[model samples]
Target: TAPFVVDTAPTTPPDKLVAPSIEEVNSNPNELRALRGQGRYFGVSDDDNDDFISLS
Candidate 1:
């Protein structure tokens, strides 16, 4: 019989949080704008949901 094995490990954080460059932000205004409001950007949202909140 062969021995069973599994690999389970949590992802590690990067050494730094590099902000997007001016060109990168300009290339995606809407994308960066959302993140500016609350330090996050959601790729998905429901129009019928009003529970969403914003810091801006």
Candidate 2:
């Protein structure tokens, strides 16, 4: 399936990388939160939540 969210914003060119939290990994296997956290703020939906996750 296409990713639940698509990243379409300016971002680091890969040379720069940041570590990800396991909670962010297991909870967001798709890494949507990570993308939002980095710079793709509006890349995903705010409704993508389930008590634990609120997408910001």
Candidate 3:
């Protein structure tokens, strides 16, 4: 994998970040999946089952 800098200003901080509830990070749409695939891991919740917990 290639290393690159990113802006985490939109994401929760270390002390605030939490393993989002399964429901919190699951069931994303195409656009969302695309963002997640690009390292944009945090977003608002919707209905589905697409848990994005780990970067590995």
In order of listing, the candidates' clash counts read 0, 0, 3
* TM agreement with the true structure for every prediction: 0.27, 0.17, 0.21
lDDT of 3 by residue, 1-55 (tens): 7598777678645886556576766564765655454545544356437777777
lDDT string for model 1 (1-56, tens) is 76976768776778899877867655665654456645344433444187988989
How many steric overlaps does candidate 1 have? 0
Q: How high is the lDDT of residue 38 in model 3? A: 54
Q: Clashing pairs in model 3?
A: 26-50, 27-49, 27-50
Better of 2 and 3 by TM-score: 3
**How much lDDT does candidate 2 score?**
0.62
Residue 32's C-alpha lDDT in candidate 3? 68
Better of 1 and 2 by TM-score: 1
Q: Write the per-residue lDDT of candidate 2 for residues 1-56, one digit (tens) a residue.
A: 87588768887578657687766455554665546555566455566556686677
Q: Give, for candidate 1, the lowest lDDT window spanning 10 residues.
A: 39-48
Worst 10 residues of 2 by lDDT: 24-33
